Amino acid sequence: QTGSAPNHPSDSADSEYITSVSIGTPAQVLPLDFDTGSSDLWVFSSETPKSSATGHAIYTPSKSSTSKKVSGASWSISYGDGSSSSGDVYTDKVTIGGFSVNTQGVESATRVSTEFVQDTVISGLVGLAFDSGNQVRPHPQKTWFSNAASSLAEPLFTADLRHGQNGSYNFGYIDTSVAKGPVAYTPVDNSQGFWEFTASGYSVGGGKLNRNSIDGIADTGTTLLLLDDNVVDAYYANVQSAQYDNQQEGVVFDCDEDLPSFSFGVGSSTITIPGDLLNLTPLEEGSSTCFGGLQSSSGIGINIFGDVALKAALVVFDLGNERLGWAQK
Template sequence: MKASLAAILLAALAEGAVTGAWNSSTQESQGSQLSESGGKEFTLTQVKNEGFTGRDGPMAFMRAHMKYTQKLPDFVLEAVNSSSELGMKYAAFSQVGKQMGSVAAHPTHGADSEYAVMVQIGSPPQSIPMNLDTGSADFWVLSTDTDQKMLKGQALYRPASSSSSRRLVGEKWNIKYGDGSSASGILYLDTVQIGGTRVLKMGIESPYTVSNDIANDKFVSGILGLANSAANTVRPVPQGTYLDHIQGQLAQPILTANLRRGAPGNYNFGFINRGEYTGNIQYTPVDQHHPLWKISASGYRIGSKQSQLKIDAIVDTGTSLALLPQRVVDELYSQIQGSFRHPKLGMMVFPCKSKLPDFFLSIGPYNGRLPGEYINYAPIDHENCYGGIQTSAGLPFSVLGDVFLKAQFVVFDYGHQTVGFANKKL
């Protein structure tokens, strides 16, 4: 996962934040324990937003595309131009970064996007709900530096209240988005604690102002990026990710994701829990010329029909939808009675009562199963629903977002630079 010029624009546009207040009494992580080797192992469990209100399919689709490319597909732009409601959403989204120091994480609203992880920042510790994102490498958080008139009561990082906080003068961060806009801010070093591990001088990116889209999110306050640090946007000295800093503390330099549909999932650091998956884990190497978790799948199967089409894809916990090649999307929805591309949304939709086929992603001999019901992302109205698999047309790769990952047990192996997949009980 080495640096590439195209990859620098990828940081921090993470899906998953939502509205509502977080419940500070929720258990967010188990205390770390020592393995036989003496390294630490711990579990970080997602916390639920009790005030969550629902998913926004079109925003999830636009955000997923604009996280990785310079413009939306032509057919989506046509839908934007023909729909005043969609046009307003696009305008609010695409204006992000045109204010000085604005930042966007663009979380997707929805029943499966109502979770965050709790992170302790500063001395004494301040509890901050954040999104864990394997699709970016920046650690940014709303703070007392952020324009308070724009905020809605989110939990804030307060550097002045931390005895260990120190601003690094001259260090700045600048995230370039696919639409050409940017986000920038200042940098602190402070203590960060997660699950019994601690980093004394973690780089914390603090924005001055935020877009309305972010300001209206009352739950999540920042992004915990865990891609390769080559994608970090701090300059002149890029900052390491939290996992970069704690690898030496862990029993093994690995992170596993066991996300769930309609329920809190969990991340394990330093170990693999055999009880969280079935069968064997199939590993595949990461593209060493890319800073994100980019892999190559050897094919796919829809129902009983197998294809050997190679699919290069980013494994991204920070994106809600799965974006796949147009050929795959066409084949999938041809098997769903009544499906069609919505002219005012640019998305594939179908009658909510439709029977949906299972989808399998192939990695060598392994077939990772996505049950048909998981493809139903959210209702549009009483009749039709958004598809959780949409086209990756216009992107340089496919994206395996949460729709797919919630059906899989996933291992991010930093030591061997591989990603592992296994099926699990759903």
Template sequence: MLLPSTPLSVALALSLSWPVFAAPQVKSSAGQVMSLKRRSPSDRTIEEWGVWAKNHKAGLEAKYGAGQPQKRSTGTNLITNQNSDSSYFGSLAIGTPAVSFDVILDTGSADLWVAGSTCQTGCENVPTFDPTASTSFQNQSTTFSITYGSGQASGALAKDVVQMAGFSVTNQVFAVCDQISSGLLSNPVSGLLGLGFQTIASSKATPLWQTLVSNGAWTDPVMAFYLTRYINQSNADSLEFGGSFTMGFTNTSLYTGEIDYISLPTTGSYWILPLSTLTVQGTQVSLPSGSASYAAIDTGTTLVGGPSQYIAEIFAQIPGSAPGTGNFQSYYTYPCSTSVSVQLSFGGKNWSISPQDFQLSQLTKELCLGAFFELSTGGSAPSWIVGDTFLKNVYSVFRYNPASVGFAQLSDFALANSGSTTESVPSATIGSAATSVSATGRSPTRSTSDTISDIKVSRTSLVSIAFFWTIMAIAGLLI
């Protein structure tokens, strides 16, 4: 999760590879879909894992401060999974004519920014946005800067048409960055899309998602994630099918049973829930109540971070575990022979974290690194940051009104696609938007076109498009 003037989540700190383009935007009675893509990491040495772990902790601490419409619609964007669950990104399109860009999807921040064509540092081999190529571009002549634990991005604010998953927003404020810290971006990712509330936006602008939902563009005031798992899978590629991000509806083919919604104890900033119980190896860890229990549900963060005393209690339930040293300080190691069972509850049902996800990495033949680590946040930031280590195990829903986050059990269909190396990485196309709204508050309108236009893909992308339609049909999303 990336917040205003906060660190870019681990997602961006990790290396990103392969270009991925905006998801197909198609009109459907059920809605459009945005696929996520996932990238797997190359093998790391213990030293490399140590550097990664240290940067991940520093990044989160910096990020959290050590702040009557016409017919509505739905949309889906297929996701890419990067580096074996290190990060998940989707795609959107900017400008006229529209050009697609891959962006980290982050419920822990609220700004949209991309690298610009005049970028001077930190954007080598990264697709960049050229303002002069868009006839609808409006320079706001306002400086922008955002700081993450792993670096900083700065530039200027602008307005333009932004499209995503079949939706189009005119006059959307975003930042075009020309100074980016080295390593913050890596091909194919060009920036970040914040999915938090406006109050935490460094730009002070209304986020893309909030413009859509507040204008009544969505059938239901929800957005949802299904994330795939490839962690510690040796045959995984750097980019894999990552799941889906939906706007305006929940995909019933991806979960079973009811969605367990928990109201936000505080609204208008992060997607926060109270962490009420935490159970490890059958033993419940004693947790505080009130604001000390608050946890940010953060799609832009890889792991789970929390106060040192409770992280220590978690690993105290695992025989043979030990605190890390050096770059692994604030992390814990444990015997790889131990299958660790962890359950979290936010005031409703108990949700299990797979032992696969608890094991961040196997450092030696016998020693493994845990995915929970000690984290110190500051100010009004929540004490816990719950990232993809947990979110891969559930179908997660972020509801605007009433403000809440919900979880549901993944369906057999969803589980079958997780970890499958036969699934194609989604490729994006740019199509005509089915629903359009203005960031200035104009009522949403429907376009008269329901065809996909301006398709710009390589020959290899055609395979992914065929897969996209196959998945849509199976999932019952084809319209």
């Protein structure tokens, strides 16, 4: 038994990826942000202030014959970007790509921050990091993937993100037909609740991998590839027009640059992010200056293999073996 759910980029700069989720009986279809960097499944609902939820699809638990309020449960969360939300908790059937979890914790937001209010095309998050990170008190809720894992064909899911095109979030099987190389695995350290791994080294513009390893997290909920100042300096070293732009808070360069690839080692196997995928977006319509997909992680204190990196590969989040797989796309 498997699920396969199409996703799409929210905008021309692949800021975040949007996937439909069906909650309740009959199904209420919400667009949610699948986030392997967090552990709460939370939604805009009929209990979200109407001034915050207007224009967003919402979950109404009273219209679902399978909903149940979880007495005494509450949750609150703050994200990397300073956005936040909080509320109470229901259980309900949650179906993603045709596969159902029958009793899933659905965290109903009674307050959401301005960032979420403005993002009308998203109605919440599906946290896909480890259960230890879940913020429901007093009794944590398991993630949708954790609940599904024992019932799927295999306890794994894959991320297939694309630049400017639909992709897929699949559960319970590995569709390597979207890829041009085999899955290469490395072990995951879930000590901090994340899909944390070590890359064995990197290369800029297709030389041989060095052995300067990089510890970081695979995070579908982060737009950029965020690496330390030493790696960023190495990446941009021969991009002649590159410079830090204090308004953008990141490195920019002429849009017509022929950017080098950025490669990194998963065990001894190479995954290469082509230069095309390291040019995120023109600074504005018709601009001759573009913003790099690879930027510094100095501000956040952890390296993040976000969507820019994930786009280069089919990425296998294996909860059964606690390992992370990358197949070149």
